[PDB]
Amino acid sequence: PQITLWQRPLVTIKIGGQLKEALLDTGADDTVLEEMSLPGRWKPKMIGGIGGFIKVRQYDQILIEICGHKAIGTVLVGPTPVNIIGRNLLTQIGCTLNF
Amino acid sequence: PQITLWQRPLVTIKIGGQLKEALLDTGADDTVLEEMSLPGRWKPKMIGGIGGFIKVRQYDQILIEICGHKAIGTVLVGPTPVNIIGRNLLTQIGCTLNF
Numbered sequence A, B: 001p002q003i004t005l006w007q008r009p010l011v012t013i014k015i016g017g018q019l020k021e022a023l024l025d026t027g028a029d030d031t032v033l034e035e036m037s038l039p040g041r042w043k044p045k046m047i048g049g050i051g052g053f054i055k056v057r058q059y060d061q062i063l064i065e066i067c068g069h070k071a072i073g074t075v076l077v078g079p080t081p082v083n084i085i086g087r088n089l090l091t092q093i094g095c096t097l098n099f
């Protein structure tokens, strides 16, 4: 699909059998999700946004469907204002910017 | 052009005579730039994201040239770690997300 930016690019994602809303974010290197329970072990990671750095939990090889497109990759879980789909997963679904 | 997301989507922008590097950010509602002087009056504003909120100066109707394309809009100036071009300006240059 072609998505214009007059409105926030929110899409529906499916993770852990649940539907959630997430933002297609080209300015985010990583994918960061709000607090939830994910399988396996986690590693620590510090990530910096606009207001500073936060601590998140890193989970690898997590399956997540974005608009019907399956992706499997690294997801970070921490205190985020909204679920964010970053470049690591945007590249998997073949997302590009055009103008 | 067609920009891929393997690397951060940086582009050259021109504002107030100066040439700067900036991120094409679909996740950002606003355009935030690193400390600089812009003509006219400003209004104080707090913008937030991951890591918290920062205080910025809101300048309205500023002209920016993003890859040759001219655009007019509100620009926020403050202690951001990177120059970011948000949706308010991305729409003006006809930027879309495709996949």
Ligand SMILES: C[C@H]1CC[C@@H](O)[C@H]1NC(=O)[C@H](Cc1ccccc1)C[C@H](O)CN1CCN(C(=O)c2cnc(N3CCN(C)CC3)c(Cl)n2)C[C@H]1C(=O)NC(C)(C)C
Binding pocket: A023, A025, A026, A027, A028, A029, A030, A032, A047, A048, A049, A050, A081, A082, A084, B025, B027, B028, B029, B030, B031, B032, B047, B048, B049, B050, B081, B082, B084, B086
């Ligand atoms: C994800 C991290 C991984 C590693 C880094 O790559 C990283 N990226 C980022 O953080 C980049 C910046 C960056 C890039 C490289 C290096 C350092 C920093 C910004 C990010 O792309 C967008 N980000 C998405 C979440 N988000 C919201 O949903 C949101 C929306 N609205 C809000 N509200 C709620 C209603 N209110 C009325 C009004 C305020 C609030 Cl608080 N928050 C804030 C927004 C943001 O920051 N917007 C701006 C205008 C402030 C810029």
